[PDB]
């Protein structure tokens, strides 16, 4: 949304640019509350290098994820 | 005024709660267009409230008639040209020229006088 002047129709001279509003944020319920600490652990792809098909990457990731026992994977 | 979707016990509709002056005073005196209008028992305004050469009231609707047994009378006619400059500053459009042709009988009935217009003026 913009506010500017156009006094011919042709051409908008901008002057003013209205600053974008978010959406609210997650209302948390009594319950939501009440679960304890966790850990998520995060990776993107990809997993082999760009050169190989081995995977290696990938086992390292496992050994990690085993060893750390996170409680969510993504 | 009475809102538009009013709902009663005993009613269950009701009409003409937003309607306009100008359509019932057209519709009920049966004024079909320009045409000549008698108006009885004029009442002289304390001020004028207009910039026409005569003035006059009417107190109530019903006393204004139409009769169309009379021939129209011719208008005049003003014809003008204009031009403009941006504002070298900001976004104004400034005037610097006027020029208007203007012709003091054009008849509605007849047809278009030769020349069209009689005198004229300018402005720089």
Redesign the interface.
Known sequence: IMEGINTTGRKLVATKLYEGVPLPFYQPTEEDADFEQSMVLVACGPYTTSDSITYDPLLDLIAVINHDRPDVCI | QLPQDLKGETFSHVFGTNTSSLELFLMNRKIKGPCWLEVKSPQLLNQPVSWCKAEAMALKPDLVNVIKDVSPPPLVVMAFSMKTM?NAKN???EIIAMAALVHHSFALDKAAPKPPFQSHFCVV
């Open positions: 941006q976004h104004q459009n």
